[PDB]
UniProtKB/Swiss-Prot annotation:
Function: GTPase-activating protein for the ADP ribosylation factor family (Potential). GTPase which may be involved in the degradation of expanded polyglutamine proteins through the ubiquitin-proteasome pathway.
Family to which this protein belongs: Belongs to the centaurin gamma-like family.
Subcellular localization, as worded in the UniProt entry: Cytoplasm
Protein name as it appears in the record: Arf-GAP with GTPase, ANK repeat and PH domain-containing protein 3
Domain GLD: 4-167
Coiled-coil stretches noted in the UniProt entry, renumbered to this chain: none
Quaternary structure annotation from Swiss-Prot or TrEMBL: Interacts with PML. Interacts with expanded polyglutamine proteins.
Binding site for GTP: 12-19, 56-60, 112-115
Lineage: superkingdom: Eukaryota
Tissue-specific expression: Widely expressed.
Amino acid sequence: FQGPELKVGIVGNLSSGKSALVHRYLTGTYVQEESPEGGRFKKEIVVDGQSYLLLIRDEGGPPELQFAAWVDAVVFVFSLEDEISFQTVYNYFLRLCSFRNASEVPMVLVGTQDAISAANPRVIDDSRARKLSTDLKRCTYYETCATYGLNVERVFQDVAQKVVALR
């Protein structure tokens, strides 16, 4: 008996860091190897003194009909060191909007720090990340770093809370 199901989709390209993000969230460990096929998971959570079963779906490509209809909320992911992943979030958001009313779907935007290094620095300015957030129906933006857990738990709690509020 784990509580009501909440449906959370994870959307972004293969350079985004989304497999690592979900894996840190579920296990507390950093595994870098990303999953081309994505992955479906579940995790018990507490939001406002009540238990919920969070259903996580990383579908592994652009949103399609079935995914777009299933989500309660979407976590969009790009890498702070990859322009293509950044542009892909916007495209993938537009494809969601083909199937769903965005105003009915809480969203969070995540810029991952994971792959940044001295020789491979950040490419995406915070101002541009924020402008992208306002295109995504003014959703909340977080930087994360799954190497050590920075904002990982905060991101999923945030979207869990947004979903129960709307119920």
